[PDB]
């Protein structure tokens, strides 16, 4: 299954620019796009997926700024980037889920809010 | 090439069971799910289930659970459906199927690559 | 179950002439259909993926559209290696489910 480059928390102010909150398979071997399949979770909804195979992301209302950098997805990095009104709308615990192929695994990071 | 050979034609007794092979070649086996689809001779192809040959998951369609059973053998690049308590409307062609160069999809996205069927009658 | 069902059951028509066939499901299946190619004894060809993605190879004649329940395969020019049942299959819940098929013949 895969494996991750694990991260407990992340942490932001208003005076971040973008939120990423990472995501790095270690193990990846997919070769397309394609092959790949990133779901993140946070407290039970899809907040986003990327269809690697229809090359077809979807957000909710809520999450309009949320995206990952396809480019870099065969690097192993399903990071998640969004912009500073939905991240503090929205502190808590996210869920990494990439599927590739057949295999598959996912990883957890909290977003975390530090007021200055 | 990806090519999927499946076992020969075989006729057995109602009641008996069968066991249908299709050895997959020109792709990594364990990257993909292995599927099985039947058609019986003047109707429609119905799906049966499918194996992740990495995981070793299946599932199957509720009409044959407790009947069929789908196996891999990893080393020898071969996917198994063995079908028991054959009755005569078991006849069909089965097909082993296989998905694009996709994420594990099951069939969602379209079987893109079908062995060549293999004819099974039930008769005494 | 999802059901399908394919209209019409057999067709005949000339080469060049546009052909059109319809599948429809019991219910919405969210663009989640692929058209098949069968010819007698012959296992089955991927032609369409998710209502309209050509499959690789399949040549540009061929096209889906749809939405819900509703979904159309429409062969432009139609040709004499066109010949075959075509079925579709939707991919949105288990089991998956194929149409009874239409058989498309040559007149010459």
């Known amino acids: 299954q895969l494996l991750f480059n694990k991260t407990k928390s992340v942490e932001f102010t208003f005076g971040n620019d973008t939120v990423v909150i990472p995501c790095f398979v270690t193990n990846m071997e997919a070769q397309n796009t394609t092959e790949v399949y990133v779901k993140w979770k946070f407290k039970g909804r899809d907040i986003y997926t990327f269809d690697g195979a229809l090359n077809k992301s979807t957000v909710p209302t809520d999450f309009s700024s949320a995206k990952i950098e396809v480019s870099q997805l065969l690097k192993g990095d399903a990071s998640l980037k969004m912009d500073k009104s939905d991240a503090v709308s929205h502190t808590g615990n996210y869920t990494c889920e990439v599927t590739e192929l057949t295999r598959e695994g996912e990883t957890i990071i909290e977003l975390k809010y530090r007021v200055v | 090439e990806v090519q999927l050979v499946q076992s020969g034609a075989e006729v057995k007794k109602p009641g008996a069971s069968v066991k249908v092979s299709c050895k997959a070649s020109g792709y990594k086996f364990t990257n993909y799910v292995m599927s099985w689809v039947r058609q019986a001779p003047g109707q429609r192809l119905e799906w049966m289930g499918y194996?992740?040959?990495?995981?070793?998951?299946?599932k199957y369609n509720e009409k044959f659970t407790g009947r069929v059973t789908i196996t891999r053998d990893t080393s020898a690049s071969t996917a198994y459906m063995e079908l028991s308590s054959l009755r005569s409307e078991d006849t069909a062609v089965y097909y082993c199927?296989?998905?694009?160069?996709?994420?594990?999809?099951?069939?969602?996205?379209?079987?893109?690559?079908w062995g060549q069927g293999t004819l099974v009658t039930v008769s005494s | 179950d999802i059901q399908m069902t394919q209209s019409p059951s057999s067709l005949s028509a000339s080469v060049g002439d546009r052909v059109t066939i319809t599948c429809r499901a019991s219910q919405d299946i969210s663009n989640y259909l692929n058209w098949y190619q069968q010819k007698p004894g012959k296992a089955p060809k991927l032609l369409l993926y998710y209502t309209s993605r050509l499959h690789s190879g399949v040549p540009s004649r061929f096209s889906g559209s749809g939405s819900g329940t509703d979904y159309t395969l429409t062969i432009s020019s139609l040709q004499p290696e066109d010949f075959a049942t075509y079925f579709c299959?939707?991919?949105?819940?288990?089991?998956?489910?194929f149409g009874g098929g239409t058989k498309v013949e040559i007149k010459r």
């Open positions: 199927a296989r998905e694009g160069d996709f994420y594990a999809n099951y069939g969602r996205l379209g079987f893109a690559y």
């Open positions: 299959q939707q991919g949105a819940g288990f089991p998956y489910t």
């Open positions: 194996i992740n040959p990495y995981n070793d998951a299946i």
